Amino acid sequence: VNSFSGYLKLTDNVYIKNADIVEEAKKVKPTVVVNAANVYLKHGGGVAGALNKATNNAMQVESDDYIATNGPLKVGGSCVLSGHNLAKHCLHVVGPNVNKGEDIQLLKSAYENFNQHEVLLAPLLSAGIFGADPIHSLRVCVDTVRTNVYLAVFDKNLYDKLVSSFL
Ligand SMILES: OC[C@@H](Nc1ncnc2[nH]ccc12)c1ccccc1
Numbered sequence: 001v002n003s004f005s006g007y008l009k010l011t012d013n014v015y016i017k018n019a020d021i022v023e024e025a026k027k028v029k030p031t032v033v034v035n036a037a038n039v040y041l042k043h044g045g046g047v048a049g050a051l052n053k054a055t056n057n058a059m060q061v062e063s064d065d066y067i068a069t070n071g072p073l074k075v076g077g078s079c080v081l082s083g084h085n086l087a088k089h090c091l092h093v094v095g096p097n098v099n100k101g102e103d104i105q106l107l108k109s110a111y112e113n114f115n116q117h118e119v120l121l122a123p124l125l126s127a128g129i130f131g132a133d134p135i136h137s138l139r140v141c142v143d144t145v146r147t148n149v150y151l152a153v154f155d156k157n158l159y160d161k162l163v164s165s166f167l
């Protein structure tokens with residue numbers, strides 16, 4: 001039993017809700033919140049901009065030190081950093097950004113990172129400003145993630161569209 005509330009159950013392990021991931025994380029304080037990161041951990045917009053703003057830029061400060069030490073992530077890769085005031089940990093995961101020409105096949109690799117954590121609050125990878133089809137992102141999530149994932153979908157039209165189209 002966990003403290004996530006109001007989620008629709010899609011499969012044994014995947015749950016979905018129309019919610020603002022920032023507000024959800026502040027309420028639940030999950031062990032892991034997933035950020036829709038880029039390889040440079042430059043948290044400008046979308047989910048990343050929102051999560052970073054909610055940390056008063058502490059996420060960006062920590063991320064800049066991480067990059068200065070380790071260099072960029074790989075597309076499809078991840079790193080674990082602090083969750084600041086939002087969660088115990090933040091799993092920064094890089095899905096392919098279609099608006100940069102990156103290979104959508106890497107979306108499965110990106111979701112594989114979730115399997116290293118028993119429970120996660122997460123967005124749909126490569127959705128929104130990363131330019132992939134969200135119906136496809138949800139399908140890849142369900143077919144790749146085996147741990148317990150609570151998906152927060154920003155827009156109601158799409159939340160409603162994803163449920164009604166879910167197979
Ligand atoms: O991953 C992309 C996803 N983005 C977010 N998901 C949940 N909460 C969020 N808060 C701020 C951004 C954000 C998204 C899906 C459909 C339409 C637009 C954006």
Ligand SMILES: [Cl-]
Nearest residue numbers: 046047128129
């Ligand atoms: Cl977005």
